[PDB]
Symmetry: C3
Subunit: 64 residues, 3 copies
C-alpha cells in the first residue's frame, strides 16, 4: 500500500508538496513519450534486431 504516494513523495517526509507534484507530472509525461516512441520504433524495426536498417527505413518512409 501507498506505493504511488511514496513515489511522488520524493523526499520521504510523508507529505506531498507542489514541487513533487510538478516533478511527478513531468516524469509521467516523459515516460508516455518514451513509450509511444518505443512502440513506433518497435514497429519500424521489422526484423526486431534493435536497429533500423535502410531496408526497414525505406519500407517506412515510403509509406507517407
Amino acid at each position: 500500500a501507498e506505493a504511488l504516494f511514496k513515489e511522488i513523495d520524493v523526499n520521504g517526509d510523508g507529505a506531498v508538496s507542489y514541487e513533487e507534484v510538478k516533478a511527478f507530472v513531468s516524469k509521467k509525461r516523459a515516460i508516455k513519450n518514451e513509450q509511444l516512441l518505443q512502440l513506433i520504433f518497435k514497429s519500424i524495426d521489422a526484423d526486431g534486431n534493435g536497429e533500423i536498417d535502410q531496408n526497414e527505413f525505406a519500407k517506412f518512409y515510403g509509406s507517407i
Copy 2:
C-alpha cells in the same frame, strides 16, 4: 501604457526581436502550466494547508 511591449522587449532597445518573441511565448507557456498545476494541486489539497497528505491523496487517486 506599453507595459506588455516593455515586458517582451527584454533588452529595452525599443524594438521587439524574434528572440524576445520566442522567449516570451516560452515564458507564457510555462506560466499557464504553473497555473493549471497549481489549481489542480489546490483542489487535491483539501484542508488547504500547503501539503498533500495520504488521506487527501487517497481521496484523489481513488477517483480514477
Copy 3:
C-alpha cells in the same frame, strides 16, 4: 538517395538506433515550432524590417 536516412543516422554506422530516432523527432518538433513562430513574427513585422516596433505591436495586440 538515402539523404533522410543519413540525417537521422547521426553517428554514420549505417543503422538507425532508438537514440537517433528520439533525437530526430525532437529536432523536427523544434523546427516546426521555429517555423510557426517565424511565420507569426513575419506577420506582425508589417514593414518587414526585422524588428517589431510599438506601432506594429499595437496593431497586433489591439486585435485580441
